[PDB]
Amino acid sequence: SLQPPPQQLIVQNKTIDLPAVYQLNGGEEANPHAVKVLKELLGMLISIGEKGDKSVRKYSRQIPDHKEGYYLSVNEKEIVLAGNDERGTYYALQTFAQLLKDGKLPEVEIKDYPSVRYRGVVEGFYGTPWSHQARLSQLKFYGKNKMNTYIYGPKDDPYHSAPNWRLPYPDKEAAQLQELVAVANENEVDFVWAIHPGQDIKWNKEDRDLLLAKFEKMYQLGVRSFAVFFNDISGEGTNPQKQAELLNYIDEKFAQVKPDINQLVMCPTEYNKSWSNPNGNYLTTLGDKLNPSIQIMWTGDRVISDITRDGISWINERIKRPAYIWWNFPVSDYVRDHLLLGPVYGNDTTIAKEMSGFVTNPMEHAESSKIAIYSVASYAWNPAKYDTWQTWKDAIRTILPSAAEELECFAMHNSDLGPNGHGYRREESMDIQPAAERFLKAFKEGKNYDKADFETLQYTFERMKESADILLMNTENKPLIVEITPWVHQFKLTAEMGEEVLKMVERNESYFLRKYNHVKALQQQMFYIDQTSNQNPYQPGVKTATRVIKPLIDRTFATVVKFFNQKFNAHLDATT
Numbered sequence: 272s273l274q275p276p277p278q279q280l281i282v283q284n285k286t287i288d289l290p291a292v293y294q295l296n297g298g299e300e301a302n303p304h305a306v307k308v309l310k311e312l313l314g315m316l317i318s319i320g321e322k323g324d325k326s327v328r329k330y331s332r333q334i335p336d337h338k339e340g341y342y343l344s345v346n347e348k349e350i351v352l353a354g355n356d357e358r359g360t361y362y363a364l365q366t367f368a369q370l371l372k373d374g375k376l377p378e379v380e381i382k383d384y385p386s387v388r389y390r391g392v393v394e395g396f397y398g399t400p401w402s403h404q405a406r407l408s409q410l411k412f413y414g415k416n417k418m419n420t421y422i423y424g425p426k427d428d429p430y431h432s433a434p435n436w437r438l439p440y441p442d443k444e445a446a447q448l449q450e451l452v453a454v455a456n457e458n459e460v461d462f463v464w465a466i467h468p469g470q471d472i473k474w475n476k477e478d479r480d481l482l483l484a485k486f487e488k489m490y491q492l493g494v495r496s497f498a499v500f501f502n503d504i505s506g507e508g509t510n511p512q513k514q515a516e517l518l519n520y521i522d523e524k525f526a527q528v529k530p531d532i533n534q535l536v537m538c539p540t541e542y543n544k545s546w547s548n549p550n551g552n553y554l555t556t557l558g559d560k561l562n563p564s565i566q567i568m569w570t571g572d573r574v575i576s577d578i579t580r581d582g583i584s585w586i587n588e589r590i591k592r593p594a595y596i597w598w599n600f601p602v603s604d605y606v607r608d609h610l611l612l613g614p615v616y617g618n619d620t621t622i623a624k625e626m627s628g629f630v631t632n633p634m635e636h637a638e639s640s641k642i643a644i645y646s647v648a649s650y651a652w653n654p655a656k657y658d659t660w661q662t663w664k665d666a667i668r669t670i671l672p673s674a675a676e677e678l679e680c681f682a683m684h685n686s687d688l689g690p691n692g693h694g695y696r697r698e699e700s701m702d703i704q705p706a707a708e709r710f711l712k713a714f715k716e717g718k719n720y721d722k723a724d725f726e727t728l729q730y731t732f733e734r735m736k737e738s739a740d741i742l743l744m745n746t747e748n749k750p751l752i753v754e755i756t757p758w759v760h761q762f763k764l765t766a767e768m769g770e771e772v773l774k775m776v777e778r779n780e781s782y783f784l785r786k787y788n789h790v791k792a793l794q795q796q797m798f799y800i801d802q803t804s805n806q807n808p809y810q811p812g813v814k815t816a817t818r819v820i821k822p823l824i825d826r827t828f829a830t831v832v833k834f835f836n837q838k839f840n841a842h843l844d845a846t847t
């Protein structure tokens with residue numbers, strides 16, 4: 272397994288030992304970040320360098336002629352790690368480290384390069400911005416998965432948005448950003464610093480200059496990429512004319528004036544089809560005026576949506592360039608009581624040429640976003656070979672090797688968003704879903720329930736329980752466990768409720784009553800967790816397994832308690 276999977280892979284069913292004694296060619300001339308990892312990883316010749324370096328002159332025709340491309344070869348006599356550019360050589364070694372198993376390598380040859388030019392994460396949700404340590408750890412992660420873009424733009428950071436966008440960061444925050452930029456460079460990620468001025472911007476030279484001086488200050492901290500965000504604002508800052516003016520002005524007097532500026536990106540006010548006016552001008556203006564080199568961000572047909580051929584041809588035609596995709600998943604800032612831990616899917620795998628970048632807007636839970644981010648990295652680099660389910664499992668196993676089955680069990684039933692203002696849904700729990708649909712069917716009309724379905728429901732509950740208890744105590748990735756703990760509790764309780772509801776479906780009158788009282792106590796523990804964990808202004812609480820598992824239990828409870836209330840004439844409460 273290689274994530275992301277290379278564009279070209281030939282494997283000989285032979286395997287070389289990692290060389291006990293070796294000879295290093297090119298250590299002094301190849302990318303120092305690439306060379307560090309290699310030296311870290313460990314007579315026989317190993318050749319490392321970029322195209323044009325002496326060490327790799329012999330393989331110069333093997334090396335793909337693509338930005339970030341590389342050639343990698345292992346066989347008995349030599350090893351080659353040769354990039355088309357420095358980032359390519361870094362990537363060559365990210366692939367290398369995934370092959371080295373027990374101090375052994377397969378004999379292979381790889382020609383590799385990304386299908387989409389910019390691949391990464393936009394930290395652009397509403398809510399508590401990632402902590403400093405969460406960001407350090409993200410950046411190492413992006414580098415390993417060949418993500419090359421990090422767009423820093425937290426809605427709730429006041430030096431990024433209204434009104435302190437005009438002020439230089441204070442010293443503590445500045446020294447921190449400076450460290451983020453450095454770690455980004457070492458992992459070969461563009462740190463793109465976004466600014467969001469449009470809520471209170473005045474279209475005068477005074478504000479235009481304070482913006483420039485803001486950028487200038489960021490440049491002094493080490494930033495080499497920039498963005499200007501116009502999303503979700505009202506007022507005079509929505510003027511398309513003024514926006515493109517301001518972006519071209521920044522282009523002409525800043526990006527074009529400094530030696531080493533990489534990405535310059537804007538995010539439009541109308542940023543999805545659904546919100547663009549058919550007869551108004553917003554998007555054709557932008558397409559016509561913005562200097563060709565300036566990227567434009569786009570979320571798809573709606574604020575939350577998957578990217579299709581129709582969707583992206585539609586946008587590319589109006590902005591006269593290929594859209595830079597802002598994909599709003601696994602972001603959950605509008606369903607803050609759900610975790611979105613399922614697979615990444617729904618995005619057309621044939622349209623690499625029609626996009627200039629693909630970024631994911633993640634959750635406010637940094638570590639839990641790693642499942643989707645790994646997947647988005649695998650997709651943006653090699654969409655043609657994009658495998659939904661296998662990537663999801665690879666992610667989990669990379670993120671928590673010591674309890675990967677347990678993490679899969681939990682994430683499998685934490686995928687859906689539940690009903691929401693954007694109408695966007697994910698599958699969840701399809702494994703146990705057929706058995707649940709049947710078993711329920713049987714009851715609400717009257718016929719028998721199948722013993723196989725029943726045993727499976729009971730096997731599910733039992734596995735949910737082991738997984739919850741194993742995850743709570745896992746110390747391999749504590750930060751992930753802190754994020755998900757409230758949901759782990761809810762999940763354990765849901766499964767205990769399900770085991771008790773099934774026992775009601777199998778006996779004698781006072782057993783049924785004990786179970787019924789146990790269930791009511793379990794309901795209340797859930798209400799408790801729901802009222803006191805994750806109490807945020809917007810969707811307070813903790814919901815879990817809500818697509819199939821919860822409604823299954825709530826209904827098998829109402830029904831067995833209905834049967835009872837008439838076969839014994841009692842008045843038991845049946846709500847949930």
Ligand SMILES: OCC1=N[C@H]2[C@@H](O1)O[C@H](CO)[C@@H](O)[C@@H]2O
Nearest residue numbers: 395396397502538597602604605
């Ligand atoms: O620019 C794209 C965009 N801006 C908003 C919008 O999409 O919805 C996201 C999810 O609610 C939110 O996190 C983001 O800040």
Ligand SMILES: [Ca+2]
Nearest residue numbers: 300301321324
């Ligand atoms: Ca070089």
